[PDB]
Amino acid sequence: DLNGAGLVASTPTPQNDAYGLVWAGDTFYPPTRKSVYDKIETLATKSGAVLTG
Amino acid sequence: ATANVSPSTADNTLALATTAYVKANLADYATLVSPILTGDPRAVTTSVTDNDT
Protein backbone atom coordinates (compact mmCIF):
# COMPACT_ATOMS: atom_id res chain seq x y z
CA ASP A 1 0.00 0.00 0.00
CA LEU A 2 2.93 2.39 0.57
CA ASN A 3 5.32 1.48 -2.27
CA GLY A 4 3.49 -0.89 -4.63
CA ALA A 5 4.76 -4.14 -6.07
CA GLY A 6 6.19 -5.52 -9.30
CA LEU A 7 9.08 -4.77 -11.63
CA VAL A 8 7.95 -1.23 -12.46
CA ALA A 9 9.92 2.03 -12.43
CA SER A 10 10.12 3.69 -9.02
CA THR A 11 8.17 6.85 -9.75
CA PRO A 12 7.85 9.08 -6.66
CA THR A 13 4.70 9.15 -4.54
CA PRO A 14 3.84 11.75 -1.87
CA GLN A 15 4.70 10.34 1.55
CA ASN A 16 2.61 11.20 4.62
CA ASP A 17 5.38 10.75 7.18
CA ALA A 18 5.27 12.98 10.25
CA TYR A 19 7.75 15.85 10.46
CA GLY A 20 11.15 14.72 11.68
CA LEU A 21 14.37 12.96 10.71
CA VAL A 22 12.85 11.07 7.74
CA TRP A 23 12.62 14.50 6.09
CA ALA A 24 16.36 14.88 5.36
CA GLY A 25 18.14 13.64 2.25
CA ASP A 26 15.02 12.53 0.37
CA THR A 27 15.77 14.45 -2.86
CA PHE A 28 12.95 12.71 -4.77
CA TYR A 29 9.99 12.19 -2.40
CA PRO A 30 7.48 15.05 -2.14
CA PRO A 31 5.54 15.65 1.09
CA THR A 32 1.80 15.53 1.63
CA ARG A 33 -0.35 18.59 2.22
CA LYS A 34 -1.36 17.25 5.64
CA SER A 35 2.31 16.73 6.53
CA VAL A 36 3.15 20.31 5.57
CA TYR A 37 0.03 21.74 7.26
CA ASP A 38 0.64 20.01 10.59
CA LYS A 39 4.09 21.59 10.91
CA ILE A 40 3.06 25.00 9.56
CA GLU A 41 0.26 25.24 12.13
CA THR A 42 2.99 25.32 14.82
CA LEU A 43 4.97 28.28 13.43
CA ALA A 44 4.85 32.01 14.12
CA THR A 45 4.07 34.57 11.43
CA LYS A 46 6.13 37.62 10.48
CA SER A 47 3.18 40.00 10.95
CA GLY A 48 0.60 39.88 13.73
CA ALA A 49 2.12 36.84 15.42
CA VAL A 50 0.54 35.96 18.77
CA LEU A 51 3.43 34.33 20.61
CA THR A 52 2.46 32.04 23.48
CA GLY A 53 4.34 30.27 26.23
CA ALA B 1 1.32 44.18 16.28
CA THR B 2 2.99 41.02 17.55
CA ALA B 3 1.94 40.06 21.08
CA ASN B 4 2.92 37.70 23.88
CA VAL B 5 1.57 36.75 27.30
CA SER B 6 2.83 39.23 29.88
CA PRO B 7 5.39 37.70 32.28
CA SER B 8 5.26 38.39 35.99
CA THR B 9 6.83 41.62 37.22
CA ALA B 10 9.38 39.54 39.15
CA ASP B 11 10.59 37.71 36.03
CA ASN B 12 14.32 38.33 35.47
CA THR B 13 15.18 35.74 32.81
CA LEU B 14 15.50 35.59 29.01
CA ALA B 15 11.71 35.71 28.61
CA LEU B 16 10.44 38.37 26.21
CA ALA B 17 9.27 41.50 28.02
CA THR B 18 5.91 43.10 27.23
CA THR B 19 4.90 46.75 27.41
CA ALA B 20 2.46 45.90 30.21
CA TYR B 21 5.34 44.29 32.11
CA VAL B 22 7.47 47.40 31.54
CA LYS B 23 4.71 49.67 32.84
CA ALA B 24 4.19 47.41 35.87
CA ASN B 25 7.91 47.53 36.69
CA LEU B 26 8.21 51.30 36.18
CA ALA B 27 5.14 51.84 38.38
CA ASP B 28 7.44 51.40 41.41
CA TYR B 29 9.97 54.11 40.44
CA ALA B 30 10.00 57.89 40.79
CA THR B 31 9.72 60.17 37.76
CA LEU B 32 11.70 63.36 37.17
CA VAL B 33 8.61 65.57 37.60
CA SER B 34 6.95 65.83 41.03
CA PRO B 35 8.03 62.53 42.62
CA ILE B 36 6.40 61.55 45.91
CA LEU B 37 9.16 59.86 47.91
CA THR B 38 8.05 57.50 50.68
CA GLY B 39 9.85 55.67 53.46
CA ASP B 40 13.39 56.77 54.31
CA PRO B 41 14.94 58.48 51.26
CA ARG B 42 18.61 59.44 51.56
CA ALA B 43 20.74 62.06 49.75
CA VAL B 44 24.34 63.21 49.93
CA THR B 45 25.17 65.80 52.59
CA THR B 46 26.76 68.65 50.66
CA SER B 47 29.18 71.26 51.94
CA VAL B 48 27.90 74.07 54.15
CA THR B 49 29.14 76.55 51.53
CA ASP B 50 27.26 74.82 48.69
CA ASN B 51 25.05 77.36 46.95
CA ASP B 52 23.01 75.56 44.29
CA THR B 53 19.63 73.83 43.93
Side-chain angles (χ1 to χ4, degrees), chain A residues 1-52:
Chain A
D1 276 332
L2 182 71
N3 299 135
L7 275 299
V8 177
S10 178
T11 62
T13 303
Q15 309 292 285
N16 189 203
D17 291 331
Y19 193 75
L21 266 292
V22 194
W23 285 80
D26 286 277
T27 301
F28 64 92
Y29 278 161
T32 50
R33 287 187 319 165
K34 184 177 180 180
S35 295
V36 181
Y37 178 88
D38 283 331
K39 181 62 180 176
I40 301 286
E41 289 317 289
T42 72
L43 297 167
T45 49
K46 291 174 70 175
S47 66
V50 182
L51 297 173
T52 58

Side-chain angles (χ1 to χ4, degrees), chain A residues 48-53, chain B residues 1-5 16:
Chain A
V50 182
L51 297 173
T52 58
Chain B
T2 186
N4 187 31
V5 187
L16 271 300

